[PDB]
Amino acid sequence: MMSNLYHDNTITVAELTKKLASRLIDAGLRLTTAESCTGGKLSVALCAEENTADFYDVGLVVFSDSAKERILGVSPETLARFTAVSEQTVTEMAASIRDIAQADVSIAISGYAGPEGGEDGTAAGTVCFAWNIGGKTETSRVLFSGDCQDVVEKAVHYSLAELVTKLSG
Template sequence: MTVAADSLQLATELGQLLLRKKWTITTAESCTGGGIGYWLTAVAGSSAYIDRGFITYSNKAKQQLLGVRSATLLQFGAVSEDTVREMAEGAAKAANANLAIAVSGIAGPDGGSEYKPVGTVCFGFFLNGQLATQRLVFTGDRQQVRQQAIDYALKQSIELLTAVIQ
């Protein structure tokens, strides 16, 4: 399978779960630049479960559109579990969605540090009032890091939603 086929398959599976649960989804994306939203809306009929998404690349956008606190950004940085937690919660509230996926990371080739190397991506998941976060480090070039983040976000959302349905 190709990357596109994998991503479309994941988005289709997630969409079926959302339809089954009668839930809606939104995204708050930084390093993925709308990639998750792209794949979600590539599925025919996705308007039944997605109304809007947010590309919040700058800190200003994270604050204005999602309500991320400046204190959080100053203390922990844009690429942190604290920030994606607030991004996910803010996106869910702004879109009135049951499920929100937030992603912020360092796709490279520059911008990394010893503590946050290139490939570091933080994920936030808001699932009907519950919040979960994760921090992963992917390898590869900019496009590979972004694609891995997109697919991981879709897979993790499927796992979280499947656990709720069962």
């Protein structure tokens, strides 16, 4: 027995950055990123794009709380109440990097890639996301399975896939 030819609907990171490049360039929009657990993998993906120079300029990688406060102006009371791994913190990260880069769109990621979780007990693999499009911000909180390299891979993909959807009509 045999069946239909199946049309697979998985999208690679490279397919996503090509799609995203098209949307941003067509709209005249510039993108910037701030990463706290993916280690620059998001910037690497965006810089691998053929026309990366036409839509992507600034990428920031920051690990510590103090660097988030000093570079990105994240409020210490935000970190005190909600920790760096929260939708509140990535909202502030995304707003600040968008201004520092003079960009139209920003992605912020802050999570625990693993193997260790939060000191507050938050599970390893918990990652928060912010997408700031022209000043309007959406956030999410996701639990990814696997080890740190797995979480980073999936988080990079997830941040891009969501942004592509948000920019599609």
